Amino acid sequence: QIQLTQSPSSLSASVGDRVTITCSASSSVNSSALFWYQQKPGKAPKPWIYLTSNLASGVPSRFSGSGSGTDYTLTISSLQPEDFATYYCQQISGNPWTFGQGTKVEIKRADAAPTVSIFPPSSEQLTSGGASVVCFLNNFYPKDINVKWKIDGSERQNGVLNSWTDQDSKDSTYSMSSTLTLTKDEYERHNSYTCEATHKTSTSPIVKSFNRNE
């Protein structure tokens, strides 16, 4: 019943930063029994770090050393973009074995603007009686962004579903998709469809639009 509490729970740091994650145990854990794992989103965890006793030259293997305590750390000497992940500590000193709650590490980055594209409903969906209008806002940073849908110029946020990707492990950007879903009947009551993206890379919103009757 040894509980592991990680701090911080999440952090953002620039490339090159020294980063240290703490794993605090509710009671003592042996140094050779505290492990770290890294997990990329959607993937299995991988073993990452463990600690061990080492014997100097000629020392017989019946000798070992360790430490006992409640404070353990993982350190990244210079944060890189591919280090985006959630890291977990685990102790196997006590039974049951336990994990910490995880620390999500994200990278700070140069502000970048989204690549925006808009797609009308496909004929297939329309024949089925539905109309989804899709907007991709790809490869931007920071992650904070606002999308407004306009229909013949008037704001519509009724029926909008948004989804953000995890941070990219190469470029450290984020992407988002926004989908406006209407009945086919409603879709045919308006002409122009617009998604406006408001991102810190300007006060002028980025706008992609089409007209249903063109």
């Binding site: 049951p96 994990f99 409903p121 496909s122 790809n138 990707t165 989908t179």
Partner: protein
């Protein structure tokens, strides 16, 4: 090379039962203590059960009496039998190989998702999204449970792909995936999105054809 591959996950009703298997290859399976570790959606890792190479077993308190962990050393397979499933049991279940006494998990399976829910299996409707660099889309709408798999051109199109996490609405998931290719590749050569929804055995390919 060493590999763990899970199967047997999917949708199950509360109170229902499910049996996970893990197939091990690339190492002498009998030698290693093996475990299951689970991860509920959006949450952290949690140890579930362990079985020594000596057959001795250990369980998380909250699955004691509902779950049974076992192994078939002749088939190089680990098993997890799950009965009396609760909503709290919904998670990705990982098989792991242990170093030494089994606690250092040095090899992991890819994981299999177990969804405990009353909602019905529903196949996805897949819609092709046609509009230097051209961006195409696939909309995968109205399915349950997770997961679906999305690839572009059976995997050959890997770079420039964003597949967005699904959103749940009224017991139905929807996701989308974009792909960006050179404007000379499309409509020049065929681009297709491949969608698998194994829960309903759905497998469909939708070629992206330009609009009239």
């Amino acid at each position: 090379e060493v590999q763990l591959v899970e199967s047997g996950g999917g949708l199950v009703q509360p109170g229902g039962s499910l049996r996970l298997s893990c197939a091990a290859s690339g190492f002498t399976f009998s030698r290693y203590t093996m475990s299951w570790v689970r991860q509920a959606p959006g949450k952290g890792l949690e140890w579930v059960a362990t079985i020594s190479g000596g057959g001795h077993t250990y369980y998380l308190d909250s699955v004691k009496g509902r779950f049974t962990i076992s192994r078939d050393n002749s088939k190089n397979t680990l098993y997890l039998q799950m009965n009396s499933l609760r909503a709290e049991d919904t998670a990705v279940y990982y098989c792991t190989r242990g170093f030494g006494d089994g606690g250092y998990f040095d090899v992991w399976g890819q994981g299999t998702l177990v969804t405990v829910s009353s909602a019905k299996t529903t196949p996805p409707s897949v819609y092709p999204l046609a509009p230097s660099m051209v961006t195409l889309g696939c909309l995968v709408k109205g399915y349950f449970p997770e997961p679906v798999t999305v690839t572009w051109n059976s995997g050959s199109l890997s770079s420039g792909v964003h597949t967005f996490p699904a959103v749940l609405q009224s017991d139905l998931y929807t996701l989308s995936s974009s792909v960006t290719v050179p404007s000379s590749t499309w409509p020049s050569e065929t681009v297709t999105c491949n969608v698998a929804h194994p829960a309903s055995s759905t497998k469909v390919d939708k070629k992206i054809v330009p609009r009239d």
